[PDB]
Amino acid sequence: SMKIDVVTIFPEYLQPVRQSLPGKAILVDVAVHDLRRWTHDVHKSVDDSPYGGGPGMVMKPTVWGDALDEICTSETLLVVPTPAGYPFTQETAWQWSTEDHLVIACGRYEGIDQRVADDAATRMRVREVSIGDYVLNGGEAAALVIIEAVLRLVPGVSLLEGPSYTRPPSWRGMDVPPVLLSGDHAKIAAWRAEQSRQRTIERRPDLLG
Amino acid sequence: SMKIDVVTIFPEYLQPVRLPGKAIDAGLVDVAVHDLRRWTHDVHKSVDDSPYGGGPGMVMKPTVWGDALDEICTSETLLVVPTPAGYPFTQETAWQWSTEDHLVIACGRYEGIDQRVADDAATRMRVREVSIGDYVLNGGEAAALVIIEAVLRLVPGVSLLEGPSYTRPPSWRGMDVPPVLLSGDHAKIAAWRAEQSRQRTIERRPDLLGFDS
Numbered sequence: 001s002m003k004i005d006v007v008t009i010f011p012e013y014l015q016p017v018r019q020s021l022p023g024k025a026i027l028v029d030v031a032v033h034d035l036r037r038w039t040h041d042v043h044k045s046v047d048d049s050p051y052g053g054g055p056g057m058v059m060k061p062t063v064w065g066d067a068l069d070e071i072c073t074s075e076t077l078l079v080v081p082t083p084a085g086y087p088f089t090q091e092t093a094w095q096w097s098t099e100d101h102l103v104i105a106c107g108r109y110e111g112i113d114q115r116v117a118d119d120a121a122t123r124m125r126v127r128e129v130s131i132g133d134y135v136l137n138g139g140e141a142a143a144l145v146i147i148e149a150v151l152r153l154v155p156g157v158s159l160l161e162g163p164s165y166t167r168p169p170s171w172r173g174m175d176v177p178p179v180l181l182s183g184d185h186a187k188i189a190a191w192r193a194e195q196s197r198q199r200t201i202e203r204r205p206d207l208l209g
Numbered sequence: 210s211m212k213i214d215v216v217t218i219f220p221e222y223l224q225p226v227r228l229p230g231k232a233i234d235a236g237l238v239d240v241a242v243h244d245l246r247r248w249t250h251d252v253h254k255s256v257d258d259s260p261y262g263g264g265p266g267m268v269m270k271p272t273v274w275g276d277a278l279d280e281i282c283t284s285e286t287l288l289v290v291p292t293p294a295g296y297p298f299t300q301e302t303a304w305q306w307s308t309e310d311h312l313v314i315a316c317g318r319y320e321g322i323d324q325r326v327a328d329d330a331a332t333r334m335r336v337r338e339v340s341i342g343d344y345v346l347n348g349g350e351a352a353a354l355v356i357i358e359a360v361l362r363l364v365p366g367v368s369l370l371e372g373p374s375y376t377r378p379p380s381w382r383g384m385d386v387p388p389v390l391l392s393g394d395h396a397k398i399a400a401w402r403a404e405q406s407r408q409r410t411i412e413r414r415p416d417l418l419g420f421d422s
C-alpha cells in the first residue's frame with residue numbers, strides 16, 4: 001500500500017500517471033496538489049527574487065512550508081527533484097518502492113528556498129535527486145519518471161540489453177540472426193551475452209571501467 | 210522553427226506537453242502525437258509479438274513501425290528512440306538537437322522494438338538510440354517528455370552543481386539566510402556560491418569532478 005502526493009504549480013502535468021494506474025486502487029493512491037492552494041496573497045505568489053542576486057526566481061519558503069506541513073508526516077519520504085540532486089537510479093527506485101508515503105515537491109524557476117528542505121529534514125527523510133545530466137524547466141517531468149520507475153516495482157502496479165527480434169524472420173532485406181532460430185539455447189545465451197558486451201563497450205563504456 | 214512527431218501506443222500520455230506548451234503556443238515548435246495503431250491492418254490491431262530466441266515479454270513488430278516511420282520521416286529527420294540500452298542523453302545532446310528541423314520520437318513498450326526498425330531507418334536518416342538515465346520505465350513516453358522539455362527550452366527564441374538558493378524572508382522558522390547573501394558584496398557572494406557549488410558537487414556528484422562513485 002503506497003500513497004504518493006505530488007505538489008506542483010502545474011497539476012494538469014500529472015494527469016497521465018493517474019490515468020495509467022490500473023484497477024489496483026481497489027495498493028496505490030496518487031494525489032496531485034496545486035501549490036497555489038497554500039499561497040498567502042491575492043496574487044497567489046509562489047516565487048520571489050534570489051538573495052545575493054542572480055537570474056530567475058526562487059520558490060517561497062513560506063508557501064512550501066505550509067504545503068508540506070499539511071501533506072507530510074513523520075513517516076513521509078520527501079522527494080525533491082533537482083538538477084543539483086543525488087542521482088536517481090534503479091537502486092533508488094527499488095529502495096523507494098517499499099515506502100508507505102512519498103511526497104514529491106516539484107520546483108520551478110531556479111529551485112526552492114533551501115530552508116524548506118533543511119527544515120523538513122529535521123522531522124522527516126528528505127531526498128534531493130536528479131534523474132539525469134540535463135536541465136528541465138521544472139521538476140514535473142522528473143516526477144513522472146520517478147513515479148513510473150518506482151510504481152512498476154510495486155507488485156500489481158552491469159551490462160546493456162542487446163537487440164531483440166520478432167516475426168517476420170525476414171523484413172526489408174534483414175534476417176533475424178539465425179542463432180535465435182537454432183534451438184541451441186546455451187549458444188543463444190552466449191550470443192546474447194556477447195551482443196550485450198559489444199553494445200555496452202560502444203554505448204556505455206563507463207559501465208565497464 | 211522545429212517540428213516534433215511522437216509515435217506511441219499511448220498518445221494520451223503525451224498530453225503534459227500542452228513551458229513546452231508556451232513554446233507551441235508561440236509557434237516556435239509544433240508537436241504532433243501519433244497513435245502507432247493507426248498503421249495496423251488486422252482487426253485486433255496487434256503491434257507486438259513474442260521474441261525470437263526466447264525470453265520474457267513481447268517485442269514490438271517491425272512491420273507496423275516501418276510503415277509509421279515511412280509516412281512520418283524524411284531523410285532530414287533525426288529519429289530518436291528512447292531505450293535503457295541507448296547512448297546517454299545529456300545536456301550536450303539537448304544543445305545538439307536544439308538546432309534540428311525535425312525530431313521524430315519513437316516510444317517503445319514491453320521489451321522494446323525489433324532492432325531492424327532502427328537498422329532500416331538508419332539507411333535513410335540519422336538515428337539516435339538514447340537513455341535518459343539508469344532506471345527502467347514501462348515505456349518510452351515519459352522519456353520523450355523529458356527529451357522534449359530539455360531540448361525545447363534551448364531553442365533560439367525560447368559542469369558543477371548549482372548551490373542553494375534563498376529568498377524572502379531573511380529569517381524563517383529560526384533559520385537565517387546566509388549573511389553573505391544579504392551583504393551586497395558581489396565578490397564575496399560569488400566566492401561563497403562557487404564554494405557551495407563545489408561542496409555540493411563533491412558530496413552529491415563526485416564523478417563530475419573526476420572522483421570515484
Ligand SMILES: Nc1nc2ccc(F)cc2s1
Nearest residue numbers: 082130131136137138139
Ligand atoms: N528545472 C529543473 N531541472 C531539472 C532537471 C533534472 C531533475 F531531476 C529535476 C529538475 S527541476
Ligand SMILES: Nc1nc2ccc(F)cc2s1
Nearest residue numbers: 291292341346347348352
Ligand atoms: N521501457 C523503457 N524504459 C526506458 C528507460 C529509459 C529510457 F530513456 C527509455 C525507456 S523505454
